[PDB]
Amino acid sequence: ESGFVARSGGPDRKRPHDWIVWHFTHADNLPGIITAGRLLADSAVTPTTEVAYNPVKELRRHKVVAPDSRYPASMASDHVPFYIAARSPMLYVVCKGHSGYSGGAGPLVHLGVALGDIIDADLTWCASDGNAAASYTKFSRQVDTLGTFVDFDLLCQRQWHNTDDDPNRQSRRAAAILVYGHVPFELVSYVCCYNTETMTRVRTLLDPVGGVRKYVIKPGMYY
Amino acid sequence: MTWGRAVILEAMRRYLQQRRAMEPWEDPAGISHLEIQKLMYFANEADPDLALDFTPGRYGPYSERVRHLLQGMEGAFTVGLGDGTARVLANQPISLTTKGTDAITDYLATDAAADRVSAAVDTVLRVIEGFEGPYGVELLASTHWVATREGAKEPATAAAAVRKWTKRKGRIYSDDRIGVALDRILMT
C-alpha cells in the first residue's frame, strides 16, 4: 500500500499511538544489531554495511533537531529514523542504488515499531513533517496534533509522486519519527522483507533472540 | 562563451551536487528548467549586469532570456530542452554534457570573467543552502521577489503576496513555510 499501517486497524488521525513506524536496514547489519540488542544512531558507530548515499549521511550530521527547548542538543545523525509510510523516498534512493550500495530491495529489512511503544518506553523522540534535512522542515513531539502535523492524507495514498503544482509531495512522504540515541530491539514488533531468502535468513537470526514479532513478506513496501 | 552561459553551466554543476545530498530521490543528472530559472534569478540579483529581466509568475520569477540561453546551448553544452513548443511553459530535465563540463572547467581556468562567475554562483549556493530541490528554490525565489519588488518584508505581508502569484497554499505556501523563507532572505 502506502506502507502506512497501524496495529488496531487502518491508521487513524486521532490515534497516533497505534501507528507503526519503520526503520530499514541491510540484512547483514542484523547480527550486529542482535549483538547490541538495540538499533543505534549513526553517530554511535559505523554499520556493518552502509546502504545510504554518503553525502546524504554527512548532511544529517549537521542538521539540528530541536522540537522544544527541553529537547537535548542533538543532530539528525544522533537519532534513529523510523519512516511513517514504509514505502518512502529514502527507501527508493537505496533501492535504485548509487556508488556506495547497489543491492536493490533484496537484502533490505523493515523493522516496525509502534509509536505508542516508543512513548511508553520513556524514549526521547520527535516527528519531522517531511524531509528531515530540509531547512523548512519542522520537528514536533506533541502527540495530540501529530495527525495534523504530518500530511496524514498523503501518507495514506498509494500514489504520491510530485506534480507541477505540488513539488513538495515526495519530501512530505519522508516524515519520520526520530528516536534519540537508540531503540531497544524488543520494541520491534514487525519485520517485513522483500523476498523469501531474506525472510529465511532473518528468522534464522531472530528465532533465538525474540519471539512475538509479526513477520511479513511484501514486495509492495519496496521499489 | 559569454558569461551568462558560464553562470548557467556553473550553477548547474554545483547545484546538482548540493541537491543530490538534500533531495537524493531527485534526478541524478537532470535539473528542471524551472529550477535553473530560480537559480538564475538569484544570480541576477547577485550580479545585476547579467540583465536577464525576470517577471513574476505562478512558479516564481521567469526569464525569457534564460530560456533563450539554454536553447542556444542545446545539443552542445546542455541537453534536455529538446525542441519545445512556441511559448509553452515546458519544464524538462536539463543535463550538462561532457563537452559542457569540459567547457566550463576550461572557462574558469582562464576567462576574464571567471572570478565573477564563481562569485555569483557562490552567492546563489549560499542563499539556497537547505532549500535545494524544485520546491525549495521556488519558495525562496517567490518570497525574495515579493520582499524586494513589492516591499513585502514582514511575515504577514509576504505570505499574502507570495500566494497571489502562486495561487496555492496547502502545506507548501503556508505562513510557516513562507516565514522560514523570509527569514533566510532577510539574513542573506
Curated annotation (Swiss-Prot), chain A:
It is an enzyme of class 2 (transferase). It holds the Pfam family DarT. InterPro entries: DarT. Residues 47-63 are annotated as: NAD(+)-binding element. Its EC number is 2.4.2.-. Keywords: DNA-binding, Glycosyltransferase, Nucleotidyltransferase, Toxin-antitoxin system, Transferase. It comes from the Bacteria. The keyword Kinase does not apply. Interacts with cognate antitoxin DarG (via C-terminus); this heterodimeric complex neutralizes the toxic effect of DarT by preventing ssDNA binding to DarT and consequently inactivating the toxin by direct protein-protein interactions. The NAD(+)-binding element stabilizes the ADP-ribosylating turn-turn (ARTT) loop which confers substrate specificity; both domains contribute to ssDNA-binding. Toxic component of the hybrid type II/IV toxin-antitoxin (TA) system DarTG, which plays a crucial role in controlling bacterial growth and bacteriophage infection. Its toxic effect is neutralized by cognate antitoxin DarG. ADP-ribosylates ssDNA, preferentially in the motif TTTW. In case of phage infection, DarT toxin ADP-ribosylates DNA, which inhibits both viral DNA and RNA synthesis and leads to abortive infection. This is DNA ADP-ribosyl transferase. It comes from Mycobacterium tuberculosis (strain ATCC 25618 / H37Rv). The gene is darT.
Curated annotation (Swiss-Prot), chain B:
Keywords: Hydrolase, Toxin-antitoxin system. It catalyses: an N-(ADP-alpha-D-ribosyl)-thymidine in DNA + H2O = a thymidine in DNA + ADP-D-ribose. One of its GO terms (cellular component) is cytosol. Induction: Part of the dnaB-darT-darG operon. Its EC number is 3.2.2.-. One of its GO terms (molecular function) is ADP-ribosyl-[dinitrogen reductase] hydrolase activity. Residues 1-188 are annotated as: Interaction with DarT. GO terms for biological process: DNA damage response; purine nucleoside metabolic process. As expression of DarT is bactericidal (rather than bacteriostatic as are most TA systems in this bacteria), inactivation of DarG may be an attractive drug target. Disruption phenotype: Cells lacking this gene display impaired growth. A double darT-darG deletion shows no change in growth in culture, upon infection of mice, or upon exposure to a variety of stresses. Another group finds the double knockout gives a competitive advantage over wild-type cells in liquid culture growth experiments. Knock-down of darG expression leads to increased RecA expression, ADP-ribosylation of OriC and growth arrest. The keyword Ion transport does not apply. Belongs to the DarG ADP-ribosyl glycohydrolase family. The N-terminus macro domain alone is sufficient to neutralize DarT from non-cognate T.aquaticus in E.coli, DarT in M.bovis, and to de-ADP-ribosylate DNA in vitro. The C-terminus is a region interacting with the DarT toxin ssDNA binding region. Antitoxin component of the hybrid type II/IV toxin-antitoxin (TA) system DarTG, which plays a crucial role in controlling bacterial growth and bacteriophage infection. Keeps the toxin molecules in check under normal growth conditions. De-ADP-ribosylates DNA (probably) modified on thymidine by its cognate toxin DarT, which neutralizes the activity of DarT. Experiments in which DarG levels are depleted lead to cell death; expression of wild-type DarG protein from M.tuberculosis or T.aquaticus restores growth. Interacts (via C-terminus) with cognate toxin DarT; this heterodimeric complex neutralizes the toxic effect of DarT by preventing ssDNA binding to DarT and consequently inactivating the toxin by direct protein-protein interactions. Co-immunoprecipitates with a number proteins known to be involved in DNA metabolism, in the presence and absence of darT; includes alkA, dnaB, dnaE1, dnaG, dus, embR, mtrA, nrdE, nrdR, polA, recA, recB, recF, xerD, Rv2258c. This is DNA ADP-ribosyl glycohydrolase. It comes from Mycobacterium tuberculosis (strain ATCC 25618 / H37Rv). The gene is darG. The chain holds residues 164 to 351 of 352 of the full protein.
